[PDB]
Write a protein that binds this ligand. Structure first.
Ligand SMILES: [Mg+2]
Ligand SMILES: [Mg+2]
Ligand SMILES: [Mg+2]
Ligand SMILES: [Mg+2]
Ligand SMILES: [Mg+2]
Ligand SMILES: [Mg+2]
Lengths: 233, 196, 204, 212, 222, 195, 226, 195, 196
């Protein structure tokens, strides 16, 4: 049993017709203090998987090292490490999911919420969630923390069920993700303007975008708002 | 919350962010924390929003009734009314209020009233959760008898840093300028102050 | 410890076609100990019926209170109180004890004597009105009653069909609750005749 | 829960209710509260349902191993003590168990042992365990004799559970009757309390308080 | 303080027919007031004509089902590909659950299939392994809403034959798979109306001597 | 205090009440009468927290005796029981509630009927053929359920009461030092001096 | 509960879902959360349902008496000031969280009120368990100078976000439109996207299925003449 | 369990021990023998937490019986009591201590003397002319202080024991269902079947 | 405590105050919080003095043994050893350590390791109770590739403000300069830095 110290907020993601998108801001909070502004919370594993991690950053860095080690280990005595016996999202997830549940069962959890986004060998989209309790679930849209409450509603308007996935394009999906990231910046007190976004497409492969910013923000209406009820000036 | 009031050559300026949070959720991102208890006596509110609104309303009532009988109250008088409420009801209040006002006799004055209900008259005052991060900056950069443009820059830069580090602070930077000329409201948006 | 589940018991009310039905078990207990199998929870003031679940001392007290108030109402108004009005009186009376409430789950049932419209309503312990069209449930087996009513109920039942539905809703809900049962009563209410029926059920 | 067991001329009577509750919620009316440890031994269940089930089935395995090694029926004393020594090792851990280990051997005759999760192991003629034990005791104590017939003893045990099923909110469902002889136990049926109550009320004249 | 348990909501329902069994469950997965997934399969085919669902805390539910499926696999290895009978599976699950008696799988487990005489079988477990063969069992969030309805509509409790007035009970006639599925769907429709954690979708696994068959139905998504 | 029983038979109400008074680790008295005559044909037994029990009983007694004098009329057992219930129902939401459970055994001279009322400290009233407070009911209600008939004679009621007391003396851990039995009928209240 | 308020060109609109809950159980599937303080001042409530209803009636009653006393139509700021001062006095124990909206001779107004007595001004607001789902929609689609039809659409879409994604919210969308120089139009069950499907079976019992012990006529009539 | 008394007279040790076993609300048994014969001339009575009492007593019994067989010799009461004390003194600092209080009554065949040892669950041993555990002493010691003589006969010891039991039955709140009395002398151990 | 490490053109400089407090009592007013785990790898300690001393000693041991086998360790390696200890024993430690070192290949590097045991490589780092008050100042005044004299002034001014506002901080300002030239210790007394 511990308490999280340096924390990362919402990880949001969704499926689209050819793959998955995942996104997360670059902030490492220290309680209310916005301590670290250059934290990458999307960690790619090979060229077919991106693990997005929220919650305790020290535990994230540990998990990051486990995944790095997993790649090394998979390459050992494996002539097809960059082909048929490459790591799959489903392997990476199941490994993490095992670890999370074991750690909670020893009453010493990795204080995280994790979303494993990727594309399988057969071209299928992989999107599944796991957290400090070892709880796992899958959905056309997935989000952690505040993202669950604010991003999912918006992302579910695009892909409301499984049959919407083939109708959704990468441009529509990315637009929804980017809009969701803006909404979270308006409303999540532990979020930042700067974020990273990853697209894992079955055709174009992994596209990792760094140093993105929330833009087209609406603030002008603030000038008209005065007082808290009766004040006019 | 990040709030501050700064005296300068022509009078005084109050500054504030616009973020109100319920835990980590931003309940209001365009809050007006600069509130008016009299024509040229304003205050900055920090702490319980219910408490500080209730207090400010009572003060405004007291100063309105004062004005009807005895004419325009001094800034010191307004601070005293705030203090009386905050001190006597210290057990049931969570309020941190900066009182700023402009007389023609006394010019710009700033009074800060922290949790306990004590009063402190200062050249400038900072308060709210985000103030902790700018004690160093504000102490280094404040000068007395600054111009209006210099004071606006001082407040804008200070609250920019407070907002940058404090998650409880954010949104727009509101300002209210109190001088002989009158009352001027200013607003500064993220795209302006973030690049400072 | 929990006042609403010391004595136990349940009430259920249902609307039908030109009729309402209200029913209750007969159990009064001290937690596990069964004390009385004749503790009726449905009272009536004129043609308005009130069922009350929860802490039995309050059930009794409120009955005596509403008898008191409806009797004065009648003397002053020169007419019997109506279900819609009585519902508001129950709500007012409960909320006046906002920070020291009666631990009860009242249920109003009746037929407006002027319009002929069937009416039911429920309340939490603090006065919030639940004015449902279909049915109202209350007591220690409210979950069970919700499940029974939701599946068994259908609108515009005739009095003698409604009787079967509400009876089977109560009985099977009570048989899944330790603190409910020990007999049951069902009131079938029409605009100018009411029939009271004691049900045969398992006595454990 | 209400379970009882008493020694008499014709052996042992075991009678149990069938109800299982989670708070006020009646989880099951068809719970088997008599374990058939083996064809000669019976165990009753009160307290933790799992704890009783698991460890009394386990007891059956230990009793079976005993008679395989010793070529002789295990004594009621030995069988009960295997269970009591086990639960005593788990004392403090939070096991919840109240049981009668009932049997009829050559060297002992009919024997009943009350075994407890606190480690209590008592031999006796009449035992009653569960939330409704007090109600069953009343009927038992006022009607018990050593020279009861197997027919009358079976009824007494059935009636004593009915008494408890009626009054105790956490007892009911149905009554399971067993009659333990030296040649093994004999099941005497499942009796729904709902139907049994009205039957007993009429034939016996009892429960005049209740309207039927 | 770290709380190792959580509530993923959901509701399950097992009904044993005369020569078939059904294990049904909603496909909604939740935490608190949020929906995690509108389609997260809860009832699983574990092989050997046995179906299983561990409702409650999903992490413990998935862990148990995973371990049981494993147990079935190893039963084949160790005992010459012998079929695991439903009663043997039940006893095996008791030991899995009681194995964690002092740190329980926070789930209400139900399995369904056919007994060795080819009759329908449902078994029901508490979190610590106590179990019983039953004809009817609802589990999870809306269990308290569904069981009374089943007592009435499956076992004909409190129902008597008209004209006799309480003297003759309604006879316990056997239900067909089409009849059971109607009761299952109405149970889940009713549970969806009155329970916030129930909804989205209903998945029913039907076990007969021919094998396991699935049926899916939409539920309200509010 | 501990055990108080009540049984309404054909033509009378019988109240049995323990004689023990214990404070801590010592039985201070073994002849305590846990009852008060409210009126010539109304008896109230009581059990609960020390001090409160007698204070409440005597307070009720005074009020009924006051009513009796003012109107020159005996209140019906039903009326007395309703007055008592209201006092307890008022008490439960007080600064310091009366922690007292009572049985009211009375003979209604108007209806010519015995009447037994069981009221607990919350103000929970129930009219019964037989009643008890505390753990007494747990042992005795099974016997009373079995043997009780509404047409029983006073002598049969006493025999059934003996069987209840014997069961209590067998299975209860506390030694309550026997019971004082009192009969309430048309002729008034009397005490059975040998029990 | 999901409740929203949205300012527009010539007025304000409020909306709410219609699910009231007791724990995980749905007590009422068509609850009316849009309360009338005065003819053109309406509010929606979340939190303790008795408190929201009670506090709106009390202030609404006093607002009416005040309106009669001053010979003027009531103002939203008066309702706001009266609500906040009442709630503040009870220090949050009255669990009423309200979105107050209306039109008066001053203009159109939109406020929120929390249980401890703090109030906020805005062009778009949301409250209750589904406020985060609703606000996400409001933040995505709101703009300055909305028309009446756009604001109703935005408001009900925000309520829907709550209905679908928040378990505490569900059933139907109520709306009330308060436009300047017009009567407020209460639109009870404006949307109905959650009608229960037809059950598979009819559970109407055969008459004489339930066992009865006694029957009797209940005398509801008064004492009769002669 | 509840009351265990011990008295050492001229030529014997007498142990009186209650018969009740009350688990909670009900008295499950009224004929329980709270004693074990450790050796032919050594008897140990016991009282404490359920399960622990009998488990401890039988464990001690086994160990002494093992010693007796190994050496073909009976340990002196003093030696047995010292062995028992050490076990309890070891127990008190264990993960889960034995919550058991004992009286060891033995006749030393070497010295031709009765001996009574009182040992509590902490391992506090004292040799006494008369002893008790729990609340038993709180009454009986005043009577024993007054009447006891070291030259008393076994019959006088029993009469003094009756007076102790009568006082307990009068002033104790709990019904301990009488006592089983056992005498330990030169001829061994025997039970007084009428008491 | 007020500690900071700043990279600059020629390498890196570590800075610290000298106050150690037991509650409000200053147990040591001349503490050396700049500690040496290797020739040109130093650290600044904040949190439990017992914990940070125990950790630093273990790290120094590990780097000494490393050096014996594999030659001079990198600053990153030192930070990794600190992290391994702080992370794995996070439940039983209260340690906030800034690691600063000079390679010839990598030049000046700064790593910060907060309570959790996470590692963050930064151009400069601040830590300790007094750091809160200078986030604003340090962010505004830091530049990359400063000269030695500029970096000394930056640290001196920063810690001056931290000391001014934080009661837990005070005494002298110690500094350690890490460059190719070698290791230079600097000290600055209250009379110097207070008047800044
Ligand atoms: Mg053993
Ligand atoms: Mg019962
Ligand atoms: Mg919903
Ligand atoms: Mg001693
Ligand atoms: Mg330490
Ligand atoms: Mg200092």
């Amino acid at each position: 049993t511990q308490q999280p110290i340096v924390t990362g907020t919402s990880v949001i993601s969704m499926k689209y017709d050819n793959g998955v998108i995942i996104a997360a801001d670059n902030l490492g909070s220290y309680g209310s203090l916005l301590r670290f502004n250059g934290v990458e919370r999307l960690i790619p594993v090979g060229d077919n998987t991106v693990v997005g991690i929220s919650g305790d950053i020290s535990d994230m860095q540990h998990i990051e090292r486990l995944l790095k080690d997993l790649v090394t280990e998979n390459a050992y005595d494996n002539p097809l490490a960059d082909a048929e016996e490459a790591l799959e999202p489903s392997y990476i997830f199941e490994y993490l999911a095992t670890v999370m549940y074991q750690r909670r069962s020893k009453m010493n959890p990795l204080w995280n919420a994790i979303i494993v986004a990727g594309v399988q060998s057969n071209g299928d989209q992989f999107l599944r969630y796991v957290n400090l309790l070892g709880v796992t679930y899958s959905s056309p849209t997935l989000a952690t923390g505040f993202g669950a409450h604010m991003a999912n509603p918006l992302l579910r308007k695009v892909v409301d069920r499984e049959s919407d996935i083939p109708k959704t394009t990468v441009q529509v999906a990315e637009e929804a993700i980017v809009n969701a990231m803006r909404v979270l910046y308006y409303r999540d007190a532990r979020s930042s303007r700067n974020f990273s976004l990853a697209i894992i497409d079955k055709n174009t492969g992994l596209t990792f975008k760094k140093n993105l910013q929330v833009e087209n923000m609406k603030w002008d209406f603030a000038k008209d708002i005065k007082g808290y009820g009766t004040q006019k000036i | 919350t990040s709030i501050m009031a700064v005296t300068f050559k022509d009078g005084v300026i109050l500054g504030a962010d616009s973020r109100t949070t319920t835990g980590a959720y931003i309940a209001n991102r365009v809050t007006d924390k600069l509130t008016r208890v009299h024509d040229k006596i304003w205050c900055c509110r920090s702490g319980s929003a219910a408490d500080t609104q209730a207090i400010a309303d009572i003060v405004q009532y007291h100063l309105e009734l004062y004005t009807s009988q005895y004419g325009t109250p001094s800034t010191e008088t307004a601070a005293s009314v705030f203090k009386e409420l905050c001190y006597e009801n210290k057990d049931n209040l969570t309020a941190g209020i900066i009182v700023a006002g402009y007389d023609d006799k006394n010019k710009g004055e700033v009074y800060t009233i922290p949790l306990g209900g004590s009063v402190h008259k200062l050249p400038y005052a900072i308060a709210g959760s985000g103030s902790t991060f700018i004690y160093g900056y504000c102490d280094k950069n404040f000068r007395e008898n600054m111009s209006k443009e210099e004071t606006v820059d001082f407040i804008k830069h200070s609250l920019s840093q407070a907002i940058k580090w404090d998650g409880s602070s954010g949104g727009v930077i509101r300002m209210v300028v109190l001088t002989a000329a009158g009352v001027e409201r200013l607003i500064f948006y993220p795209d302006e102050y973030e690049q400072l | 410890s929990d006042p609403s589940s010391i004595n136990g018991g349940i009430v259920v009310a249902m609307t039908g076609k030109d009729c309402v039905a209200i029913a209750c078990d007969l159990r009064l207990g001290s937690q596990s100990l069964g004390v009385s199998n004749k503790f009726e929870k449905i009272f009536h003031y004129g043609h308005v019926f009130l069922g009350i679940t929860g802490l039995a001392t309050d059930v009794t007290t409120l009955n005596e209170m509403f008898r008191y108030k409806t009797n004065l109402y009648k003397l002053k108004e020169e007419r019997a109180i109506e279900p819609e009005t009585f519902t508001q009186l129950v709500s007012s009376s409960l909320y006046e004890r906002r920070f020291g409430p009666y631990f009860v789950g009242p249920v109003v049932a009746g037929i407006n004597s002027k319009s002929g419209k069937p009416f039911i309503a429920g309340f939490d312990l603090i006065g919030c009105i639940d004015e449902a069209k279909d049915f109202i449930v209350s007591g220690t087996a409210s979950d069970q009653l919700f499940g029974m009513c939701e599946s068994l109920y259908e609108p515009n039942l005739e009095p003698e069909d409604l009787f079967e539905t509400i009876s089977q809703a109560l009985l099977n809900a009570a048989d899944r609750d330790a603190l409910s049962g020990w007999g049951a009563v069902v009131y079938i209410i029409k605009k100018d005749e009411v029939v009271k029926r004691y049900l045969k059920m398992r006595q454990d | 829960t209400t379970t009882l067991a008493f020694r008499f001329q014709g052996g042992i009577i075991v009678a149990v209710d069938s109800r299982a509750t989670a708070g006020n919620w009646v989880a099951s009316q068809t719970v088997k509260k008599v374990i058939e440890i083996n064809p000669f031994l019976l165990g009753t269940m009160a307290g933790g349902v799992a704890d009783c089930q698991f460890w009394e089935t386990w007891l059956g395995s230990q009793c079976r191993l005993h008679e395989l090694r010793e070529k002789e029926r295990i004594s009621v004393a030995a069988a009960s003590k295997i269970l009591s020594n086990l639960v005593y090792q788990y004392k403090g851990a939070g096991l919840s168990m109240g049981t009668m280990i009932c049997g009829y051997t050559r060297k002992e005759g009919p024997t009943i042992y009350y075994v407890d999760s606190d480690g209590t192991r008592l031999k006796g003629d009449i035992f009653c365990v569960g939330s409704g034990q007090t109600f069953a005791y009343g009927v038992l104590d006022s009607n018990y004799k050593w020279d009861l017939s197997v027919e009358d003893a079976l009824y007494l045990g059935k009636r004593s559970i009915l008494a408890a099923a009626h009054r105790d909110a956490y007892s009911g469902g149905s009554v399971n009757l067993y009659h333990v002889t030296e040649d093994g136990w004999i099941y005497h049926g499942n009796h729904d309390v709902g139907e049994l109550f009205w039957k007993v009320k009429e034939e016996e004249g009892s429960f005049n308080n209740v309207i039927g | 303080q770290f709380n190792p348990y959580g509530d993923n909501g959901g509701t399950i329902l097992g009904i044993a027919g005369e020569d078939f069994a059904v294990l049904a469950g909603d496909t909604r997965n939740i935490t608190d007031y949020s929906i995690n997934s509108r389609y997260e399969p809860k009832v699983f085919d574990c092989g050997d004509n046995i179906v299983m669902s561990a409702n409650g805390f999903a992490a413990d539910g998935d862990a148990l089902v995973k371990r049981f499926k494993n147990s079935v696999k190893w039963y084949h290895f160790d005992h010459n590909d012998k079929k695991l009978s439903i009663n043997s599976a039940a006893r095996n699950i008791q030991h899995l659950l009681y194995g964690k008696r002092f740190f329980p799988y926070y789930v209400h487990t139900i399995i369904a299939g056919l007994d060795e005489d080819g009759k329908g079988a449902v078994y029901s477990f508490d979190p610590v392994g106590s179990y019983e063969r039953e004809q009817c069992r609802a589990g999870g969030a809306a269990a308290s809403l569904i069981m009374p309805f089943l007592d009435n509509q499956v076992n004909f409790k409190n129902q008597y034959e008209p004209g006799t007035n309480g003297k003759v009970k309604k006879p316990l006639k056997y239900l067909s798979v089409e009849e059971v599925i109607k009761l299952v769907r109405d149970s889940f429709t009713s549970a969806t109306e009155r329970h916030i954690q129930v909804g989205d979708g209903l998945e029913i696994l039907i076990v007969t001597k021919d094998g396991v068959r699935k049926e899916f139905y939409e539920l309200k998504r509010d | 205090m501990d055990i108080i029983l009540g049984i309404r038979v054909q033509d009378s109400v019988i109240l049995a009440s323990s004689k023990a008074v214990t404070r801590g680790i010592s039985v201070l008295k073994d002849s305590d009468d846990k009852t008060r005559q409210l009126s010539p044909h109304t008896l109230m037994s009581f059990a609960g927290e020390a001090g409160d029990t007698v204070q409440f009983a005597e307070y009720i007694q005074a009020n009924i005796q006051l009513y009796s004098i003012r109107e020159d009329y005996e209140l019906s057992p039903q009326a007395v029981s309703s007055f008592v219930r209201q006092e307890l129902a008022k008490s439960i939401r007080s600064r310091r509630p009366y922690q007292v459970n009572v049985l009211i055994g009375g003979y209604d001279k108007k209806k010519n009927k015995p009447e037994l009322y069981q009221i607990d400290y919350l103000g929970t009233k129930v009219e019964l053929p037989y009643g008890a407070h505390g753990y007494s009911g747990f042992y005795t209600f099974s016997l009373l359920d079995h043997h009780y008939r509404p047409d029983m004679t006073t002598e049969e009621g006493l025999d059934l009461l003996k069987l209840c007391v014997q069961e209590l003396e067998k299975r209860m851990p506390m030694d309550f030092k026997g019971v004082i039995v009192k009969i309430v009928d048309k002729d008034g209240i009397r005490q059975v001096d040998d029990f | 509960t999901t409740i929203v308020g949205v300012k527009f060109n010539n007025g304000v609109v409020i909306a709410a879902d219609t699910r009231s809950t007791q724990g995980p159980i749905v007590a009422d599937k068509n609850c009316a959360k849009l309360h009338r303080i005065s003819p053109k001042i309406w509010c929606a409530g979340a939190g303790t349902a008795a408190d929201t209803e009670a506090v709106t009636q009390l202030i609404g009653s006093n607002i009416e008496l005040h309106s009669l006393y001053t010979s003027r139509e009531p103002r939203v700021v008066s309702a706001l000031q009266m609500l906040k001062q009442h709630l503040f006095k009870y220090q949050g124990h009255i669990g009423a969280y309200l979105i107050v909206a209306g039109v008066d001779p001053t203009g159109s107004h939109l406020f929120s009120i929390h249980a401890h007595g703090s109030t906020d001004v805005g062009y778009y607001l949301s409250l209750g368990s589904g406020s985060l789902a609703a606000m996400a929609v409001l933040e995505s689609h709101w703009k300055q100078d909305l028309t009446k039809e756009e604001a109703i659409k935005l408001a009900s879409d925000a309520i829907q976000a709550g209905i679908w994604n928040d378990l505490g919210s569900g059933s139907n969308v109520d709306v009330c439109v308060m436009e300047i120089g017009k009567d407020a139009e209460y639109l009870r069950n404006y949307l109905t996207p959650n009608v229960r499907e037809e059950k598979q079976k009819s559970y109407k019992f055969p008459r004489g299925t339930t066992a009865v012990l006694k029957e009797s006529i209940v005398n509801i009539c008064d004492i009769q003449e002669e």
